[PDB]
Paper text:
The AAA+ ATPase valosin-containing protein (VCP)/p97, known as cdc48 in Saccharomyces cerevisiae, is an essential and highly conserved protein involved in numerous cellular functions, such as regulating protein homeostasis, endolysosomal trafficking, membrane remodeling, chromatin regulation, autophagy, Golgi formation, and others. Its core function is to unfold ubiquitylated proteins in an ATP dependent fashion. Previous studies have established that post-mitotic Golgi reassembly requires presence of VCP, as well as two adapter proteins, VCPIP138, and p4734,35. VCPIP1, also known as VCIP135, is part of the ovarian tumor protease (OTU) family of DUBs, an essential family of enzymes that remove ubiquitin tags from proteins to regulate protein homeostasis and function.
To provide a structural basis of how these two cofactors simultaneously interact with VCP and a framework for understanding this process, we determined the first structure of VCP in a ternary complex with VCPIP1 and p47 using cryo-EM. After initial rounds of 3D classification, we were again able to observe density in the two binding regions on VCP, similar to what we observed for the VCP-VCPIP1 complex (see “Methods” and Supplementary Figs. 6, 7 for details). We used a combination of symmetry expansion and focused refinement to zoom in on these regions. The binding mode of the three VCPIDs bound to the D2 dimer is indistinguishable from the binding mode observed in the VCP-VCPIP1 complex, with the stalk regions connected to each VCPID clearly visible. Since the interactions between VCP and the VCPID in all structures are unchanged, we conclude that p47 binding does not affect how VCPIP1 engages the D2 domains of the VCP hexamer. Taken together, the cryo-EM structure of VCP-VCPIP1-p47 complex reveals how VCP is able to engage with p47 and VCPIP1 simultaneously and maps key points of interaction between VCP and the two adapter proteins involved in mediating Golgi reassembly. Given that these interactions are maintained in the context of the VCP-VCPIP1-p47 complex we report here, we expect that they play a key role in ensuring efficient Syn5 deubiquitylation for membrane fusion.
Author numbering:
A (entry chain H): 590 to 655
B (entry chain B): 199 to 430, 436 to 588, 591 to 718, 724 to 774
C (entry chain A): 199 to 429, 436 to 718, 724 to 774
């Protein structure tokens, strides 16, 4: 259910594993790609300029993984 | 006979505008002096050739008395140097003697084309002569000029200044009703069998103009004559007994090449809400943003609200975005101009982004209008879903520039449409430019029934088949998929009919001694066609739009607010 | 001294169009104006030079009996300024005076070329005078003006307006039957031998036009004269001057055609027998192309829009072109082929504007099957999916999309794609309202291979002992290209053996000075030897690609369980 995505912006690298929690009954705890991408970017790349590109790439990676 | 209003059709709106502009001044010259108001000096009509602009001017002149002088551009230029100036001056000189009068300059582009198209000296002298004549026309005795040109950019801008051809009328391309009227006018002196319905050909003759329809009628009549001529200052009753038939019209229709296929068509779409029959919230949003501003301006003034410039659709491919835009344009009875993605791609490749200004001028000239941009993301995709740069590009930049320089007083509304709401340039979504995102979800069961019914509206369908069941089990299908199912069923029915006809012909061959085998699209046809059905957009595709709508437009709608 | 219809050849269809257009208005002047119709004010024939369009105009004028007046564009432009307009006015007034009449303006481009070409004041004044005269024919009665130009865009667009030149007839270039007709017309007076088969000559003389064929006939006659030069004209001596097929072949090898590059538009001679396979593909192409021309009423009855086109995909060289030509033949519809190099040339030169010209030509030749040989060529050039900095959209494919969108379904012009790499094709061209149909062309099976072999040997005098049916059985997985290669190798071996045998016979004559053909036909051992030299162009793994593509498309297809109580 979890797949790895690493942020690469401005000559940098990190290690992370995204957790997917879909199929939950409430349908709210189910993962949202954009929320996950923004959370990961802010957690690993806090206050980084031009992070919309990185978030877009992370979203594309999430979509392909899912 | 003398030309008149009833002798011209397909330009009722423009004809009424020209009447409003010109009839009152010429018919009642004394009124203008009393009120001390400025009448028009020159009305410049533009449109593709063959729209009968000369006929419009002739009718307006005849129906208001006055004197009509025609100046043909090619004729003026054909004359020797100096002779052209003499004739051009003499035209205006004489026109006043019979004032009030209307002078029609046909093919103005020939006389005064865009300066960049001119090279010689005497070419510029004639243009200066015409400009000088126009300046003196200001004080002339109720003399008006109506010059016809292909387009506003086809003539020197010096002729478009104040005191000159400053008022413009866009004759444009006739629409279905206009085509029917033109066909009626051209078929007035023709004998036609009852099978012919001009409405069918009018609804079908897309891309034709006034001249082409006359050619179509002539070709149909000549086919009738030739088909009967072989078996036969005329042959008297035999030709007086000539009767055209719908088959002759169809054949002449298939043997004509319309001259305005590539012109941007501006007309009120015939689509209606029942074509989609769903998305009540989207209907309400479109109503609020397109109907009230043009229906209740007083409400917008009473409050400090300013109409929004436009919206932006987004969702799975082929779900009804164009359908919704056309429906909203129909509801307000507003023109509709569509700009497909290939046009934007052509502008990008050819570096012709300057044409966006022309598109917006076209939209402005015909208002209220719903300017619809089908695929704003086409350029973004063409550069990679990336080439290593920002979202900015020349075509979208020009769209932004034109949108910013648009007066909210005009009722031109911009509608976007994309399948990748994330790769769109962020600038176009800024407040003041397309500041709303409307998600067009996959059609629902009721909407699916509506779209199925709309598709089959022109196909004789057996009463046995119930579209509600078909829509029930086709959950997750897009509008394109349902139209595909209908087309497949029609194809199967046609094939069955053809094979049955072949078998009947063979039976006739063996036994030289009859009813329609399959007059309706049988249930079994829809049964087999559904086997070829396939969901176009996967749930993975639905995920992108669902997440986009769940995150954006719902991220921080915290609400839960109330004053003490 | 006067020409007629029988004198003209190679343009039967266009001649019929011209006749139906002009003869009736001219033959019955008063009757025409009595009925509320206007005849063609001006017609514009065009096509590559040398097709004798002037002869067409003269023949029409003679047959209808109308007065004829010829205007030489270069002649008119030769006259010093002022005299040109006077001559034009005199010509038009003279034509009116002897009405009904036809005015044929030859080399119109010279008088009124593209507006960019015109530079001087008099050059534009002449064009303006011509336009004014054109618009002045409405008052005149029964005066039709026909002009000749190479292309519609080679003349001032102001002339092609309404009232002025509006009807256009594309003379084009003659086809095999037309070439045979032209050769028969030209060789009417020449005394020929019994060995000449003008049918075969017309078959070989591809790319020729009337003038080229006339020059070829003159060259053959002069070759015969040269052969008989040493031994006022005596009729019997010229009777002995019997031109032979050898002279015609010599002229063929010596003549330079003037229309080789011109787009060829004619009904292909291919037939389903040439490739007797894929019955399903046959049925699909039939439904797409034949029904909407032979059953127009059915679509209206059921209200269905004919499909605009279809897309092919499969291993290289397996009949993707043969099927298209066969379907065009079945409907007797003209066929236009656009090779991949043409698209590549348009991309490299950024001349995508020519796509409009291709589509215009196809539309003018309705009904017609527009065949694009390689829609993947440009995409493959940019690296394909191996490397693509940009996206699928490109200049030429974008123009194709635009022009297909702008088409009118009433014209019965059907687009057919053809590629070996369907993966990299732009998804835009597969959208509904476009090709919107994918058909997989697989490798030929046994019966198809037998048909292919028979077709490829239909011109080689093969022996009776050859078991083509067996040869197909062992050649499993061979594409049509590979079978043609087998036949080429067999014929190469046979011809080498024949020539070596003739050399041996000559050597025998030399060594022992003092017959029958050693190899009159392709012997079985020739085919046996060639087989050992053969190879399979397409491998099993590269068939797996198309198999997987088709399987992926099919898997999307579901819901085959529509019960519908």
């Amino acid at each position: 259910e979890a797949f790895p995505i690493t942020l690469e912006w401005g000559g940098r690298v990190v290690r992370e594993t995204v957790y997917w929690f879909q199929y939950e009954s409430d349908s709210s705890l189910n993962s949202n790609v954009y929320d996950v991408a923004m959370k990961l970017v802010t957690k690993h790349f806090p206050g980084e300029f031009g992070s919309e590109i990185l978030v877009q790439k992370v979203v594309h990676t999430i979509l392909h993984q899912t | 006979n003398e030309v008149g209003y009833d002798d011209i059709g397909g330009c009722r709106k423009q004809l009424a505008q020209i009447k409003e502009m010109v009839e009152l001044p010429l018919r009642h010259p004394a009124l203008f002096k009393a009120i001390g108001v400025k009448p028009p000096r020159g009305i410049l009509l533009y449109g593709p050739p063959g729209t009968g602009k000369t006929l419009i001017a002739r009718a307006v002149a005849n129906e208001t008395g006055a004197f009509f002088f025609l100046i043909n551009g090619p004729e003026i230029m054909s004359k020797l140097a100096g002779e052209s100036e003499s004739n051009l001056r003499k035209a205006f000189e004489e026109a006043e003697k019979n004032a009030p009068a209307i002078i029609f300059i046909d093919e103005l582009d020939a006389i005064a084309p865009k300066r960049e198209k001119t090279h010689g000296e005497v070419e510029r002298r004639i243009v200066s002569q015409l400009l000088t004549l126009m300046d003196g026309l200001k004080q002339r005795a109720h003399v008006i000029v109506m010059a016809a040109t292909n387009r506003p950019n086809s003539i020197d801008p010096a002729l478009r200044r104040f005191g000159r051809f400053d008022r413009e009328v866009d004759i444009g391309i006739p629409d279905a009703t206009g085509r029917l009227e033109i066909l009626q006018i051209h078929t007035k002196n023709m004998k036609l069998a009852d099978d012919v319905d001009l409405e069918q050909v009018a609804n079908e003759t897309h891309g034709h103009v006034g001249a082409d329809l006359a050619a179509l009628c002539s070709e149909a009549a000549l086919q009738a004559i030739r088909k009967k001529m072989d078996l036969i200052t005329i042959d008297a009753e035999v030709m007086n007994s000539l009767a055209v038939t719908m088959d002759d019209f169809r054949w002449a229709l298939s043997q004509s090449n319309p001259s305005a296929l590539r012109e941007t068509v501006v007309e009120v779409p015939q689509v209606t809400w029942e074509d989609i029959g769903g998305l009540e919230d989207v209907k309400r949003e479109l109503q609020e943003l397109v109907q009230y501003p043009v229906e209740h301006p007083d409400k917008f003034l009473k409050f400090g609200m300013t109409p929004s410039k436009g919206v932006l659709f987004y969702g799975p491919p082929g779900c009804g975005k164009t359908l919704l835009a056309k429906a909203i344009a129909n509801e307000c009875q507003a023109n509709f101009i569509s700009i497909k993605g290939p046009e934007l791609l052509t502008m990008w490749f050819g570096e012709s982004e300057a044409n966006v200004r022309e598109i917006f001028d076209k939209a402005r000239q015909a208002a209220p209008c719903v300017l619809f941009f089908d695929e704003l993301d086409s350029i973004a995709k063409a550069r990679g879903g990336g080439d290593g740069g920002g979202a900015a590009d020349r075509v979208i930049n020009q769209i932004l520039t034109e949108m910013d320089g648009m007066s909210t007083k005009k009722n031109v509304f911009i509608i976007g449409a994309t399948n990748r709401p994330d790769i769109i340039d962020p600038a176009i979504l800024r407040p003041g430019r397309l500041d709303q995102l409307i998600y067009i979800p996959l059609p629902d069961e009721k909407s699916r029934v509506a779209i199925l019914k709309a598709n089959l509206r022109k196909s004789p369908v057996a009463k046995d088949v119930d579209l509600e069941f078909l829509a029930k089990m086709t959950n997750g299908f897009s509008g394109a998929d349902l139209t595909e199912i209908c087309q497949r069923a029609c194809k199967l029915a046609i094939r069955e009919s053809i094979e049955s006809e072949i078998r009947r012909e063979r039976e006739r061959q063996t036994n030289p001694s009859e009813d329609d085998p399959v007059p309706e699209i049988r249930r079994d046809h829809f049964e087999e066609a559904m086997r070829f059905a396939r969901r176009s957009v996967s749930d993975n595709d639905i995920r992108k739009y669902e997440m986009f709508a769940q995150t954006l437009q719902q991220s921080r709608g915290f609400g839960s607010f109330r004053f003490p």
